[PDB]
Structure formats: structure tokens, C-alpha cells
Amino acid sequence: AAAAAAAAAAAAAAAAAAAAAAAA
Amino acid sequence: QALKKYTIDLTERAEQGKLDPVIGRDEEIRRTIQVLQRRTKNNPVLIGEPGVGKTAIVEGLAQRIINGEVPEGLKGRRVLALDMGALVAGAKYRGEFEERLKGVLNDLAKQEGNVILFIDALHTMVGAGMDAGNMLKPALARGELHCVGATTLDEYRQYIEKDAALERRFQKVFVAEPSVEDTIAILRGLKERYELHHHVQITDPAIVAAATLSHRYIADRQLPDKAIDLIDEAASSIRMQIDSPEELDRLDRRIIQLKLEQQALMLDMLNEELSDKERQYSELEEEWKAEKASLSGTQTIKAELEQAKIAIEQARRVGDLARMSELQYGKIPELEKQLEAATQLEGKTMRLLRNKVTDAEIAEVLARWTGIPVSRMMESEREKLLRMEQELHHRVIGQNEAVDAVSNAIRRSRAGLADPNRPIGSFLFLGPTGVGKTELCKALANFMFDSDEAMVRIDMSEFMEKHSVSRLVGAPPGYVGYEEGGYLTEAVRRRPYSVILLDAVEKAHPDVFNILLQVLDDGRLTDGQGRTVDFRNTVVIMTSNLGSDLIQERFGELDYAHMKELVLGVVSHNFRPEFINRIDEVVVFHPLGEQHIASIAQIQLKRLYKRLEERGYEIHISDEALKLLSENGYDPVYGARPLKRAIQQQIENPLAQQILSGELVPGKVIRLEVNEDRIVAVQH
Amino acid sequence: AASSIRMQIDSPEELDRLDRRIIQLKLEQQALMLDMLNEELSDKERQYSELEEEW
Amino acid sequence: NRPIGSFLFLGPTGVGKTELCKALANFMFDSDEAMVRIDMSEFMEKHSVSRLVGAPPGYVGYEEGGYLTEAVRRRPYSVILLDAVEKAHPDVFNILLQVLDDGRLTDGQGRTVDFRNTVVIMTSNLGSDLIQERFGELDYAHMKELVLGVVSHNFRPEFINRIDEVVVFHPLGEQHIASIAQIQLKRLYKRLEERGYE
Amino acid sequence: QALKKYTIDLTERAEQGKLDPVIGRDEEIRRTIQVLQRRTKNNPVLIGEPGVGKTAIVEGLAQRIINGEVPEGLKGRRVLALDMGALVAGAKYRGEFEERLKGVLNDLAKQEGNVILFIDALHTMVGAGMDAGNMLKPALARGELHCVGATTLDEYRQYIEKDAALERRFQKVFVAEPSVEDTIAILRGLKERYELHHHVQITDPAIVAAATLSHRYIADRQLPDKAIDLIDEAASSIRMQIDSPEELDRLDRRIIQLKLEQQALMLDMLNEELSDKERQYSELEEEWKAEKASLSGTQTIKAELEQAKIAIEQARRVGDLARMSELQYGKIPELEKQLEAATQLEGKTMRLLRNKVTDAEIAEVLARWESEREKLLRMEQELHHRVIGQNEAVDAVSNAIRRSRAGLADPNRPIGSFLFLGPTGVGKTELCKALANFMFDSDEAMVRIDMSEFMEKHSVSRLVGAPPGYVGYEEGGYLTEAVRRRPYSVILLDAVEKAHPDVFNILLQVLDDGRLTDGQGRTVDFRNTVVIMTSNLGSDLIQERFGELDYAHMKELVLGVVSHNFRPEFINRIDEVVVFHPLGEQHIASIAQIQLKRLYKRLEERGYEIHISDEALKLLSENGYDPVYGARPLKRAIQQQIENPLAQQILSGELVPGKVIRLEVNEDRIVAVQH
Amino acid sequence: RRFQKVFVAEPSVEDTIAILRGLKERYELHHHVQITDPAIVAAATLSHRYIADRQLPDKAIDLIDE
Ligand SMILES: Nc1ncnc2c1ncn2[C@@H]1O[C@H](COP(=O)(O)OP(=O)(O)OP(O)(O)=S)[C@@H](O)[C@H]1O
Ligand SMILES: Nc1ncnc2c1ncn2[C@@H]1O[C@H](COP(=O)(O)OP(=O)(O)OP(O)(O)=S)[C@@H](O)[C@H]1O
């Protein structure tokens, strides 16, 4: 019999940006 | 076999009577029976928000099976709720869970439509540590399985609609969030259950108050569950407040105190006083034991009445003749009338021990569960309202309008006269600069919670851009700070009773007022993650100094009304008009005269004396110095803070100068005397 | 709707009305052992048997 | 090909206008939140069509969608109020005339949404001075005609003639006041019944 | 062996002849061979939009290796292709993508400089989780790998300019778009493969017509691919139509129904009728079998023709002497001429039918998924199908359209450049709609611009396009999105006189260049569109002076008025300003009649048979008529005064669908009757 | 929903003082010293006043134990 081996499980998250006008 | 080794018969506990009398929800049981006898899309699956008796609806199916209210084709069937966790554990070697699961498959095949399966949390059947979805999904997509699903809507979006390969096996058997009055009926039946375990009695106005005040105030929990838990918790509260007295504690501490005193003195008189109070203690103690015996006899005979009901249901299923009539017409009326005799005897004798749940019990439980003063008015609150008006005049002299306004608002909150469609105080403050606006808000915070800064001081001087809503509200999923939540969602969804403070709201960029629209209409707010946040137990004060020039021009020679309408038109120029009429009342401040600032000088000098006590010094001022301070720290143009600067300068500069000389000795009252121009501290 | 009508096939309701009535009056007459309820029971049992055979 | 609703509702404020919109929602659209409240009072500025409708970005109301057209893209089964049409601009009438003729309406993003399942309502207060003045001892039809002439003074008549009907809301004098105050008194009685008072 | 797990021996496939005998592109193939025999940086990339057959370019390179046309570094190599999606998709955990990737490199070093690699989706390999480019960095750099790219120019400038090792460990080889004629020769090479597969023949004028219509009525797909899809789907449709039949089904259902009837009747006559229909069905069936046998023989002799061609190519590789001349001079002309005998034979015998796919089948496949010039010959008739009057403007516009699609003037100058005047409401916009309709597609498939509005500098910044880092940016000007999403439409300019004169500069750049640079740095062409400018400056000049005054001199008079108004540079670039006179009262009455026609159409959509008095039509035409605005007040007034009382009476429960509903007059109004 | 929130509050000023008095007896068991009552009111006043990061009565214990 064998054992339930542990994993590594690479995960990821993201970013927004932001653009900004000028008035004139 | 493995059915008896890994499943749970719901209909056996229905036979054993252990399960809940499932009341209401007949229509969904009917629709469940309809889906169960459907060829394609055979297996139903229950869909709802959690906490709504889906498991109970399956047990109510089992109730109608054992009672025989089902159709004949479903009579004599079996409902075996399989335990996943029983399947998981002992499979130590390879493929044993495969072996166990395939044996369960084979036995279910052998049962041939007699056993009807029910496994909720269907994602666990999708995978149970290849494992379960790939093994059962044959019997799913072959129709041999006749199971019933039950899930939260989350797994219905995630783990069900994604695999459209499971679509034509199921059905959106949607359970609705139940209403008030079905919860009331459910609570009548479950009062009849619950008074066994807590050994108490429950008033029915307390039940409708539980339903009403549960539905009104909380939002994270839903019907029926929140009102049921209010019942169970407040029944435990009754159980505890019966389970030990308090006058016994008074007299017990008294007699042990007189015992210690009499043993120390060994004139006496205290043998006699101790003997009288020990007699009082023993009398009330034995009365307490007798009344607890009354509880005992009453509740045991109540439980015997309940067992009579259960056994006569057993005889309704079996069908005895003389036993039915015997049990009914003998056992029921005599136990009912002597239970009522014990009840009226408790109405005679229960003195310190009110065992019937009032609605005030429910309100106190709710208050200490949410935070709102839901509890009924102890008269500390009434004198606290006298103190509301007075103590607002303590930390704020001047500006009696908003004093009255906020006073009236919390008054209409406390007496229930508030509007549960809006948050309580939808205030907006205006006026000249530095005139106690943030002070009034901290004065409320000092009042309501005895803490100067315990209030959500969200400052609208950061939000001068578009993305600042993503600062205060939260973040949409997938992105950066999404799992941390915002700030307003945290500081409201924890404790719904606080003074939400929006400092200097005109500086914020005018998309944030959309959020203010949703606040000051509804009080539920779509945060970025998806959910909502109740605001209807909060106070939203917003501050600004828009019409500064106008008010400092014209507070003289004008009324309060047209000044109000004039600065109101100014606000109409600055905000949306869709915003401004969603406000309780704009208040209009004004600057101060000399008496106001003199009183403020008294205030700051008292907290200065409060400071210098800690260093170890005490000061009695010259009254002439008051005149010099009021000449110095005064201007109508700039309000109050020249007084703080003038007192700070003209007092604490030579004062600290001479403290750090080591010159001014602790022990002497530092009379702050004056020169012709300055302040001279003396040591005598 | 087909399974709904199938449930309506596996009904009726006046059967339950009369069955609760006859078992209630059976309880009463079993207690009373004036009666008249032997005759009332016989009428309602004949009615129940007729509707049952019709079903 | 015209949309369902084309309405100008004249009269003073208070008077059940929003309540009429919600009742129209309550029976035509059979719910409360089948409406999109937008006043045209905020749209005296030149950038009305941009923030209202959808624009070349750099703005705020783009990732939101917009004020009006993209909320109809949210709510295609709704009722549109347009309060304060006296606060207008040339890029108000023209967008509304494309509504009146079409229903489908050009946004900035290029995806027109039809308005022929929805109701468009305007309100104003221009001749409502005359409505507050002379509703007493005057009729309804000639008052409507005279105030339609007043709107023809204010607006271009080619704008106001694609509307289905422009109606007049009179000042609510006595019994309307008694009824609505009685409504608020009865819900007050209801909440104090929840407290336990009579 | 991950090569067995992830790669495709294309040399095996073309060695077994599985692949396209890819035609042309020899310069680019040669530059790829130049790149593939360097010392370092031994990796070409292929830059071109997908569907230009960069895959097929590598395939034809592999076929040349099969031929052995290569220099002395490539003889014996094995070209193998690879995806990144086959590697990314197995990333449960850390380090599972990358075991596959390194085992790939171990097989690559294991074959010891003998394998040429192909990888498409290079911009995919940028992002997988560092992830992918850095493990391939040494073998891309140290000559121990011969990777071949395939991607698009946008993804190149988006992804591959980021990692410099991703830049210079590859090399650009530009991939161009194939021409019209080269597509024709390609399909000529591809004709025999298709005719072998779908068992049928192909009309080659229908092939070049398919190329023409593929460029014409398709925007997205391009060559070779779109013509591939057209010919394949048309050949499949024809093969289905051959491999069925319909009259046999009708006759079979007829004979089995009359068989059941005669079985029920057992006067007769039905034995005779059944025998006649069975004989006819047997004739059709035997004709069907004879056709199928003829096409079977044609496909077998066509496949033997292709096998003879493959055999003579194998003789060109191996070098048999008499086999070359024998196979060529014997087998090619006799099999082609009896294949043409089979062609004319099946042109004779396919009746119920064809196998040679014609261009009408291409029209089916195309419009599902040709009288243009001759409709343009009758284009004035088309425009007066819908709009009455203003004949001269119709004539001049048709002149411009004939000059356009005939292509005489400057093609870099736009199609329609027309300023319009006079009072509105007569149907100028209706002319615009019907013009775009019968000209190109539709009435309102156009662009309308309200140039009454734009009077200042910021107004120009609106309609032109805001400069970057300012207010109105990310969806261009008002104009620019409107044309860039609409490659073939008509621009409308209303109230040109209200504009500040600086927008006329933008108009002049339109009329000269046709490409117009916005604030977004991209030129949106106008050369395939029509600009229409409209105004109303000499409205009263025409209204007062249309009576017995000509077209030309009044045009010149109001042209002088415009010269008092507008720029001489602007009126220089005008093609023609038409008059747009007020027509008449009877013609505007007739336009109201057409509004009644579409009204009665909508009543028939409800399902009512409603007629009218002609005096009622005259009262209608006199209700809202005004010379100052045109027919639009007449339109809305008639619309209101019909839709209100009529539908009032309908909702009064009076009108019944299916009664004589004559719209009779009132004293001033119109009532409907029920008879 | 399988639970009940029990909102443990942040403790106040003088309640922190009483907590510290009982624990003053405990640290005078351990650290072999004496503790004054102005030390108690100083630890309460200072931890509530200057530091922001940690909370009562953890940080007043930080002061006293240190
Ligand atoms: N109709 C009902 N009659 C009586 N009690 C009910 C009824 N509906 C709900 N309840 C109570 O609410 C509880 C909800 O139990 P559950 O079925 O586990 O909750 P649920 O709403 O179905 O969601 P989960 O995921 O199973 S917690 C029941 O166990 C009862 O205590
Ligand atoms: N009636 C008052 N009683 C006591 N202190 C007052 C009174 N009015 C003003 N103050 C003082 O004025 C200062 C007010 O601080 P803030 O509330 O920030 O100022 P504000 O006048 O309420 O409005 P802003 O935000 O400063 S423009 C405090 O230092 C108060 O002590």
C-alpha cells in the first residue's frame, strides 16, 4: 500500500492598471 | 452489508422518531416526488441559500413515507443517506475505496429501485479523495441511480453547471427562502419540540417577536434559522438564570462577611444577625429547592405527555384498537389537566424564577448578538437620554441646532420609531471652519460607546480620484487585495452599530456619491466581492465646509431658514441633487462669540489640569487671565483653533521652559498669574 | 405535469376525510363501551367502501 | 419602431411623479426596481452624452458601462425617468430624438440597445408656475394646450411632438395630503404595533 | 520517448504524400534555409496573420527535403513540429511542465544535431507560469536546437520585444500575403487533389470566380484558406447532391401509398397506375445507377492519373530514364483526354445534376456563409424606385457611382464628395438611406454626424479625436470609430455652415488623402465610402425661384451664395452641389401616399383591410404640410391624426379584422367605417 | 452557518487595569520583583496612548513583563 503524497500547488494573482486624463 | 456499514437510514430515525417535525414546505416535497418519478433528468437536486432545511425536506419526505402520506409507488421504499466519511477511513490498501464503492454500487443495483439515495454536498460525490465522480457518474449517466441532490447555489454555479455532461440528469429544484409566517408556524411546532430540552415554557408573542426582530435586524442569517436559534439561545438564557439565583449570592456574601467579622472579633450582636440571615438563606434556599422540584415534576410529566403522543403515533402506524382509545382518552386529558395544574401552581409559586420566555428575553439576546440596543429600556438609558442632551452640551458648547438634530435622531432610533428602509441618522453637516464638527462626531462616539475614537473615520480627503472607491469598498475578484476586503465592509459587517464618519466629503471625487446614493436610499451596498452590507443600524454623518464665506458673511441679520436654503442652493451647485434630498437634514453651523470661547477655555484648561496631574502639578488660574486668553484666542474668521494655539503658546511655553529648569517643585499649586501682557507662573 | 397527474392518480382526498372520520368515531365508540355511532360508523364505512371500490 | 414610453409629465414637485413611475413599473413591469432614475439637471454641461451614454475613455462611467444606455444594457425591461428637461443641452434633445425615432441608440462603445421594451418619461417645471397658479377654476385640456405652447416656447416643437402625450400634474391640495399623511401615520402605527402600541 | 509523445514527423507524412504540394513562396523558403544554416542564432520566426499558411511553408520546405533540394547541411535531417499547449496543459503542480520540457531537450540532444524543430504560437511560450523561454535559452543560444517560429505581427510587438533572449535567440523572416493570380495557380495545383477526394470535377472559371468573390464578399478570412473552404464546402455539397434522389423519393412514396390503397381495395385502375409509376421509378433508378457508375469510372481514372503523377515524381527523384518519357508522353495526355471525354459524358448524362461545381454553388456557400454592374446601369431607376423627384441629383450621383466603380479618377480620392442644400424634409436623408441601400447595402447602415453642434476647438477635438493623455481618448473621435467599424458606409454631415471653419481643414484632408490621422495614431481610410455634406443655405432662394427656373443657372446662383459663405479651397474640392428644390404639393402628397403604404403594411401586419377616400388623402396632405420644413411635419401630423382616433376606435371595440374599412372624411377629420 | 460568532471585544482602559492587577500578582510570583500601582496605571495609559499596533491587554503585559 502507498501514501497520499503531498503536492506543490502553484497559484497566481493579478493586477489592474489605471489611466488618468487631464482636464484642459 | 456495506449499506448497513456505510449508509444512514433516515427512515429509521423517522421510525425512531428522533427527527424534526418538518412543518410547511409541502409544495416542494410534492415537486420532489414529481421529479423522482420522471424518466429523464431523474435525480432531483435541491438549490437554495444554506440554512433552509434541505436535509430537513428530505427527512420530511421520510416522514411522509413512514406516515404513508406519499403515493403508493413510493410506499415501502428506503432512504439511506450514505456517509462519505465512513467510506473514506478504513481504505488503507490500494483500491479499497474503489472496492467498497463498487460493492455499494452492486448492492444498490441489487436493491432495484427500492432504496432511494440522498447525498448532499454533491461536490463530495464529484470527488472523495477517479475516486467518486468517475465511479458513480456511470450510475448517474445510466439511470440506475435514483438519488437526490442538495446543495448551496455556489456549487450549483461552480461544480454543476460547468460539467454540462451532468445537465440532463438533474433539475433546478429551487427552494425559496421562506417567509415570516411559515417561520412562525415552524416555530410553533418547534416550540412544542424545544421545550423538552430546555425544560421551560415559551410565550407565543415572544415567538412572533423572535420572527419579527430576527428578520428585521440580522442579514447574514436567514429564515428560518435565525429565529430558531434565538429561541434556542434565549431558552438557554432562561435555563441559566433559573440555574442559579442572585439574592442567594447577596445574602451568602453577607453571611460569610459577618462570619469573618464575628470570627475576627473573638458587644457581639452578630451571632444574632448571622443567625437571622442564615435562617433567611436557608428559607430561600429550601424554597428554591421546592420550586426546582416543581420544575422537575412539571417537565417530567410534560415529557410523559410527549411520549404519549409518540406512542400513539406508533399505534396509528401499527393499528391497535383498544390501545389507541386507551392511550388517547385516558392518557391525554388527565396529563394535560394536571400539567395545567402544575402550570398554575407555578404561576402561584415561581417568585424569582420567571420561566416563561418573554419577548424582552429575545430582545436582550438579539442586542447582545448584534450590538444594537435591542434590549428594553433599563432606566439608565432614560437618564442616559437626559444625559444625551446634557452631555452633548458638555463636550460641545454652542451650536444648538445639530445638538437637537442628533438628539432627536437617536431618540427616534431608540423608541423604535426609526425607518427600517434607511440608516438611522443620515446627517450632513456644514458651516465655517474649526467649529466643533468632528468634535460633535467624537462627542457621539464618546457618548454611545464611551470611547472618543471608536468610530469609523473614513476620510473623504483621500478619495479625490476614481479608483478610491476600490480603496474603501473592496476589490473585484481575481485582483490584488481582493481577499482582504475593503475598509467600510469590514468595519460595518462586523459591528453594525457605529458612527460612520465621512470627513470633508466635498473633496472626494464625485463618483463616490454613487455609493452614497445606495447608502442613503437603501443601506445595503454592493461591495466588490459580490455581497451586501446592512447599514440600517448605523449613523452616517458627513462633514464639510462648503458655504464658508456665505455663513461667515450672513449669520447675523438673517434667519436660520433662508440661510439654510441659501447654503442648500450652494450644495445643489456642488453635489448631485439626487444625493441631497436623500438626507435627513442639512444643519448649518456658525462661528462663536466670546462666552463660547471662554467656556471652551474652561474645557481645555480642565483637560490641561488633567494632563499636569500626571506630571504632578496643579494649577488655579487667575480670572484676569481668562480675559487675556479671550482677547488672544479669538476671531470670527477662523473659529476655535486660535484659542488652542494661544493657550498652548502663552501658557505652555514658559510653563514647559520652567519645568525643564527643574525649578517648579511638585507639591505647590502653580497659580498662573499674569503680567500686564504675559502669564507668569509662581511657586508658593 | 405528467408525473403530477400521476400523483393525482395515486391520491384521493375524501378517502382520507372519511378514514379520519371513521377512525375518530371508532375511537369514540371504543371508549363508550346511547351510542348511535355504530350506525354512523356503518354508514360512513359503507360510503368509504363504495368510494374505495369506485377508485 | 417607436419605443413604448414617450412621456412629458408637467407639474410641481412632491406630486407622485416618482410614485407614478414606480406604479407603472409595479403593473406594467410588475416590480419595483424595473426603473433607472436619471435627472437631466446634471447634464447642463457639454459632456452629457459622454458620461450619460458612453464615450471615448479617460472617464469614469465607461468601466461601469455608463449612466443610461449601459444600464439599459443591464435592464432591458425598465422605465426611464428624465427629470429637469429644462436643464438641457443640444446633446440631450438629439439623443432623445434618436430614442423617439429608434429605440436602438448609438453609444460610445458601438452596441445599440433597443428601447422598445421600455418606457421613457420626462418631467419639467417650466409652465408648472402656471400649474401652481391657475389649476383652480380652469380646465385640464386648455391648460394642457397652453402649457404645451409654453413648452413650445421653451423647446423646439419638433422635439416635443414625437412624444405620445404631455400631461399635467396639479397641486395636491387637501385630501391627497390627508391620504398620504394617513399612509405615513398608518405605517407609523404598524411599527409601533411591532413595538406594541395603539 | 517524448518525440513519440509530442512531435509529428512531417517528413514521414509528405514521404507518404499526406501533405499539400505547396506552391510558390520560394524566396522566403530560401531565406529560411539561409537562417537554418547559420552558426548561431539558428532560429527563424515567421511573422504573418494566421491562415497565410506559414505551417504550409514549413510543410513545403519539408517536401523540398523529401525532394532533396537543400544545401549540404540539411540532407538527412528530420523536421518535427511541436505545440506549447501540449506542454502547458499538464501543469497541476510545480515542476511538471518542465520535466516534459527538459525531456524534450534530452531527446533533442539525443538525436545529436539531426532534428529541425518547429514550434508555432511563440507568443504563447512567453506565458506559462521562469516558465518556458529560459529553459530553452541555452539550446536556442548554443546552436543545439533549430527552432522555427510561427506567429502574428501584433503578438510579436506585444510579446517578443520583451525578453531579449526571446528576441535574438530568434530571427525575423517576413511572411507576406498571397496574391490573386498566385492563389489561382495554387488552386490549380490543388484542383486535382480536391477532384480526387470529392469524386467530382471542378469548373476552373468557377475557381477564379471563387477567388474573386472570396476577396469581394469576405473580409476576415484570407488566402489560401478561404478559397480552400469555399471549394471544399461546395464540392461536399455537390457530392451530397450526387450521392442521394428527390424524384425517386416522391415516386417511392407514391408507389407504396398506391400499393397500400390497392391492398385495401382487394374499378381497379391502380395496378395499371402502379405499374406505370414503378416503371418510371425503375427508369430513374437505372439512370441513377448509370450516373453513379460513370462517376465511379471517372474518379478511378482520375486517381490513376494522380498516381501516375506521383510515380513520375518518384522517377524524378530516383532517376529512371525510359520511365520518365513513357509515363509522361503516354499516360498524361491520353488519361487527360479521356477524362475530358468523361467530363463531356457526365455533362450529357447528369440530369436529375452536375459534378463540375459552378460559381452559383459558390454564391450559395458564400451568401449562406452577380448583377452589380447591370444594376448600376439601371441605378437611376433604382433610386426612383423609392424617392420621387429630384431627377438631376439622382443622375449626377449615378454618374459619380459609375465613375467610381468604373474607376477613372484618382483612387486615392474618396468616392462621394457632395454638398447638399435647400430646405429639408423632402427626403434628402431618405435619399441618403435609399442611396446607401441600393448602392451598397441598407438604409441606416451609415454614419450620421450632427455638425450643427461643433463650433469650437474642443468640438474639433471631439469629432477628430482627443490627443492622448486627455479627456476623450480610448475610443477615438466621434468620426473615427464610426468609420473604422464601418468599412463601407456613407458619411453624413448635417449643417456644415454651423461649424467653425477649421473642420473644413479636416474635410480637405479627407478629400485629398482619404486616410485621416486621428488622435489615436491610426489612419481610418475614407476611400471606400461616400462623404455627404448637407446644408440649407439657399433654401428660400430656391423656394422663391424654383418656378420655371432651370437647374444649372440656379445651381450657379446658389453656388455663388456658397462662395459668399464658404472657402474657395473648399468649393474647389466639391464634386457637385445639387439643388434639392422643393418638389411640389402632389409629389409630397405621393410621399405621404407611400407613408400610407407602409402604414397599411403595418395594418396588414395587424391584419386589417383598410381603405381610404382620396379626398381624405388630400386632407391628410393638407394637414401638416409646410414649405418651411418639408414633409416631416406632414409626416408626424398625419401619423398622429391617424394613430390616435383610429386605434382609439379599435380599442373602442369597433374595428373587426376582415371588414370593409373605408377611411371616410369627417368635416375636417377622418372616420373609419365597418362594412 | 455551522457556528455562532461570539464577538470578543477589545477590552477597555480600567478593565485592562484590573486584569493587570491579577496578573501583577502572577508576575510577582515569577520574576522575583515588586510591582507598583503607578506602574499599573502607567502601563494602561501608555499602551492605550502611544503604541497603535498591538492591543490591550496584550501590550500592557508586554510592558510589565519586559
Ligand atoms: N420546514 C422546516 N421545519 C422545521 N425546521 C426547519 C424547516 N426548515 C428548516 N428548519 C430548521 O433549519 C435547519 C436547517 O437544516 P439544514 O437542512 O442542514 O440546513 P439547510 O438550510 O438545508 O442547508 P445545509 O447546507 O444542509 S446547513 C433544520 O435542521 C431545522 O432546524
Ligand atoms: N461648542 C464647542 N465646545 C467645545 N469645543 C468646541 C466647540 N466648538 C468648537 N470647539 C473646538 O473646535 C475644534 C473643532 O475641531 P474640528 O471638529 O475639526 O473642527 P470643526 O469646527 O468641527 O470643523 P473642521 O473639520 O475643523 S473645518 C476643537 O478643538 C474643539 O475643542
Ligand SMILES: Nc1ncnc2c1ncn2[C@@H]1O[C@H](COP(=O)(O)OP(=O)(O)OP(O)(O)=S)[C@@H](O)[C@H]1O
Ligand atoms: N396625490 C398624491 N397622492 C399621494 N401621495 C402624494 C400625492 N401628492 C403628493 N404625494 C406625496 O408627497 C410626498 C412628496 O415626496 P415625493 O414623491 O418625492 O415628491 P413628488 O411625488 O415626487 O414630486 P417630485 O417629482 O418628487 S418634485 C410623497 O410622499 C408623495 O407620495
Ligand SMILES: Nc1ncnc2c1ncn2[C@@H]1O[C@H](COP(=O)(O)OP(=O)(O)OP(O)(O)=S)[C@@H](O)[C@H]1O
Ligand atoms: N504556397 C502555398 N501553396 C499552397 N497553399 C498555400 C500556400 N501557402 C499557404 N497556403 C494555404 O494556406 C492555408 C492556411 O492553412 P494554415 O497553414 O493553417 O495557415 P497558416 O498560414 O499556417 O496560419 P495558421 O496559424 O496555421 S491558421 C493552407 O491550408 C494552405 O493550403
